Write an enzyme that holds these catalytic residues in place. Structure first.
Site, PDB file in Angstrom:
ATOM      1  N   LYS A  19       0.809  -1.217   0.000  1.00  0.00           N
ATOM      2  CA  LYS A  19       0.000   0.000   0.000  1.00  0.00           C
ATOM      3  C   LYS A  19       0.865   1.301   0.000  1.00  0.00           C
ATOM      4  CE  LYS A  19      -4.428   1.538   1.941  1.00  0.00           C
ATOM      5  NZ  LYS A  19      -5.352   1.486   3.106  1.00  0.00           N
ATOM      6  N   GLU A  87      16.790  -7.134   5.082  1.00  0.00           N
ATOM      7  CA  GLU A  87      17.372  -8.392   4.650  1.00  0.00           C
ATOM      8  C   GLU A  87      16.592  -8.794   3.385  1.00  0.00           C
ATOM      9  OE1 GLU A  87      16.701 -11.590   7.465  1.00  0.00           O
ATOM     10  OE2 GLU A  87      17.089 -13.123   5.931  1.00  0.00           O
ATOM     11  N   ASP A 132      -0.548  -8.892  11.512  1.00  0.00           N
ATOM     12  CA  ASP A 132      -0.752  -8.774  10.053  1.00  0.00           C
ATOM     13  C   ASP A 132      -0.070  -9.911   9.309  1.00  0.00           C
ATOM     14  OD1 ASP A 132      -1.785  -7.576   7.709  1.00  0.00           O
ATOM     15  OD2 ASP A 132      -0.052  -6.249   7.497  1.00  0.00           O
ATOM     16  N   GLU A 136       1.155 -12.585   1.888  1.00  0.00           N
ATOM     17  CA  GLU A 136       2.004 -11.572   1.216  1.00  0.00           C
ATOM     18  C   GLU A 136       3.112 -11.034   2.139  1.00  0.00           C
ATOM     19  OE1 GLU A 136      -1.706  -9.328   0.752  1.00  0.00           O
ATOM     20  OE2 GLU A 136      -0.817  -7.551   1.704  1.00  0.00           O
ATOM     21  N   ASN A 137       2.986 -11.254   3.455  1.00  0.00           N
ATOM     22  CA  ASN A 137       3.966 -10.777   4.429  1.00  0.00           C
ATOM     23  C   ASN A 137       4.857 -11.916   4.970  1.00  0.00           C
ATOM     24  OD1 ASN A 137       3.006  -8.090   4.183  1.00  0.00           O
ATOM     25  ND2 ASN A 137       1.644  -8.304   5.945  1.00  0.00           N
ATOM     26  N   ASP A 150       7.012  -7.278   7.324  1.00  0.00           N
ATOM     27  CA  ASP A 150       6.003  -6.202   7.351  1.00  0.00           C
ATOM     28  C   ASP A 150       5.419  -6.005   8.768  1.00  0.00           C
ATOM     29  OD1 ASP A 150       4.130  -4.316   6.759  1.00  0.00           O
ATOM     30  OD2 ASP A 150       2.995  -5.477   5.311  1.00  0.00           O
TER      31      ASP A 150
HETATM   32  N1  LIG Z   1      13.001  -8.125   2.000  1.00  0.00           N
HETATM   33  C1  LIG Z   1      12.203  -8.493   0.996  1.00  0.00           C
HETATM   34  N2  LIG Z   1      12.655  -9.394   0.092  1.00  0.00           N
HETATM   35  C2  LIG Z   1      11.885  -9.691  -0.962  1.00  0.00           C
HETATM   36  N3  LIG Z   1      10.680  -9.205  -1.282  1.00  0.00           N
HETATM   37  C3  LIG Z   1      10.245  -8.337  -0.348  1.00  0.00           C
HETATM   38  C4  LIG Z   1      10.920  -7.949   0.794  1.00  0.00           C
HETATM   39  N4  LIG Z   1      10.142  -7.094   1.561  1.00  0.00           N
HETATM   40  C5  LIG Z   1       9.036  -6.978   0.869  1.00  0.00           C
HETATM   41  N5  LIG Z   1       9.032  -7.688  -0.302  1.00  0.00           N
HETATM   42  C6  LIG Z   1       7.954  -7.734  -1.284  1.00  0.00           C
HETATM   43  O1  LIG Z   1       7.331  -6.463  -1.316  1.00  0.00           O
HETATM   44  C7  LIG Z   1       5.951  -6.562  -0.867  1.00  0.00           C
HETATM   45  C8  LIG Z   1       5.590  -5.339  -0.058  1.00  0.00           C
HETATM   46  O2  LIG Z   1       6.438  -5.246   1.117  1.00  0.00           O
HETATM   47  P1  LIG Z   1       5.811  -4.909   2.599  1.00  0.00           P
HETATM   48  O3  LIG Z   1       4.901  -5.983   3.040  1.00  0.00           O
HETATM   49  O4  LIG Z   1       6.932  -4.747   3.578  1.00  0.00           O
HETATM   50  O5  LIG Z   1       5.005  -3.559   2.345  1.00  0.00           O
HETATM   51  P2  LIG Z   1       3.607  -3.021   2.913  1.00  0.00           P
HETATM   52  O6  LIG Z   1       2.649  -4.142   2.796  1.00  0.00           O
HETATM   53  O7  LIG Z   1       3.221  -1.920   1.959  1.00  0.00           O
HETATM   54  O8  LIG Z   1       3.902  -2.479   4.381  1.00  0.00           O
HETATM   55  P3  LIG Z   1       3.019  -2.027   5.650  1.00  0.00           P
HETATM   56  O9  LIG Z   1       1.876  -3.098   5.793  1.00  0.00           O
HETATM   57  O10 LIG Z   1       3.970  -1.899   6.838  1.00  0.00           O
HETATM   58  O11 LIG Z   1       2.383  -0.556   5.507  1.00  0.00           O
HETATM   59  C9  LIG Z   1       5.883  -7.891  -0.123  1.00  0.00           C
HETATM   60  O12 LIG Z   1       4.566  -8.423  -0.079  1.00  0.00           O
HETATM   61  C10 LIG Z   1       6.850  -8.753  -0.945  1.00  0.00           C
HETATM   62  O13 LIG Z   1       6.189  -9.136  -2.143  1.00  0.00           O
HETATM   63 MG   LIG Z   2       2.904  -6.117   3.383  1.00  0.00          MG
END
Ligand SMILES: Nc1ncnc2c1ncn2[C@@H]1O[C@H](COP(=O)(O)OP(=O)(O)OP(=O)(O)O)[C@@H](O)[C@H]1O
Ligand SMILES: [Mg+2]
Ligand SMILES: O=C(O)c1cc(-c2cccc(Br)c2)nc2c(F)cccc12
Length: 265
Positions: A19, A87, A132, A136-137, A150
């Site tokens: 998001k 990482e 959460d 996807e996390n 996440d």
């Molecule tokens: N360290 C990582 N290595 C590989 N892919 C990653 C990594 N971190 C995230 N991703 C990919 O990027 C996507 C988005 O990352 P992330 O879940 O951290 O973001 P977010 O959902 O927007 O965060 P938040 O819920 O804290 O507001 C993940 O679902 C995964 O597909």
């Molecule tokens: Mg996420």
């Protein structure tokens, strides 16, 4: 923080989108160390008012040290963006593995649940609740080992804090969707939802609307397809209990006979 800046890295392909999180493969110029940079837009964080969540994500995740929890190495920022140094998880998400395989066998499911239960036991020992835990996390390491990532919705237990408003309700327990006080048992409910989705291919309370999903979760309305075995039905039914106090401890999940019979360990 080790005074990092964008000029210390070479950016590569996009790893995924969230998001707010825009995640890229990156390489530190001097060491050649491969990592992931989670990029967030200050204007979007400010508009949504989620600065406190970002602060908790950095504060909580930077201190956790467990092989089934993604490391957060540091952070930096410029005029318009915040950058989290993570990482790198090379085998992608459990979300993508499930779209490819459709359903997981019992051995893959039990192994993922064990790894998840070990990471959550470490979190809960510090009164850190993730809240959460969704496919996807859940990232995959070089050995195919699950890594919890996440930490944006993470908090210290107990909490009354709301998470999403329009997003997925599918992994949240009744006490969270209702706005009630909650603790570590929230992660035990999500564990049961994941165990069901891994075996069946879809979460147990999935519906076309937000209200119908909410209704199914609050009334704990789910049925198993015929192929789900007795041992898996037993563990899932113990985890998906409306009363959080009736949910098992993580040590009970790790010693469940269906888990010890099928986990790769
Ligand atoms: N360290 C990582 N290595 C590989 N892919 C990653 C990594 N971190 C995230 N991703 C990919 O990027 C996507 C988005 O990352 P992330 O879940 O951290 O973001 P977010 O959902 O927007 O965060 P938040 O819920 O804290 O507001 C993940 O679902 C995964 O597909
Ligand atoms: Mg996420
Ligand atoms: O006004 C700002 O510069 C601003 C800074 C940060 C921030 C700085 C260091 C570490 C971390 Br984690 C965050 N975040 C902001 C934000 F989330 C929204 C709007 C402005 C900032």
């Amino acid at each position: 923080k080790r005074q990092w800046a964008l000029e210390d890295f070479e950016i590569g392909r996009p790893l995924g989108k969230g998001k707010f999180g825009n995640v890229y493969l990156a390489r530190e110029k001097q060491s050649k160390f491969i990592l992931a940079l989670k990029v967030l837009f200050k204007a979007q964080l400010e508009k949504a008012g989620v600065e406190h969540q970002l602060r908790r994500e950095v504060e909580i995740q930077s201190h956790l040290r467990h092989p089934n929890i993604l490391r957060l190495y540091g952070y930096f920022h410029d005029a318009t963006r915040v950058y989290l140094i993570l990482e790198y998880a090379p085998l992608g998400t459990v979300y993508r593995e499930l779209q490819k395989l459709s359903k997981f066998d019992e051995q893959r499911t039990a192994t993922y649940i064990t790894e998840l239960a070990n990471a959550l036991s470490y979190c809960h020992s510090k009164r850190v609740i993730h809240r959460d835990i969704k496919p996807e996390n859940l990232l995959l390491g070089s050995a195919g080992e699950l890594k919890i990532a996440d930490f944006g919705w993470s908090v210290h237990a107990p909490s009354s804090r709301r998470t999403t408003l329009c997003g997925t309700l599918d992994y949240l327990p009744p006490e969270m969707i209702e706005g009630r006080m909650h603790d570590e048992k929230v992660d035990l409910w999500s564990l049961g939802v994941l165990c069901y989705e891994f075996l069946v291919g879809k979460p147990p309370f999935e519906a076309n609307t937000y209200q119908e999903t909410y209704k199914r979760i609050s009334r704990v309305e789910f049925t198993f397809p015929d192929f789900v075995t007795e041992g898996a039905r037993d563990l899932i039914s113990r985890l998906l209990k409306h009363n959080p106090s009736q949910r098992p401890m993580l040590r009970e999940v790790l010693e469940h006979p269906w888990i010890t019979a099928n986990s790769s360990k």
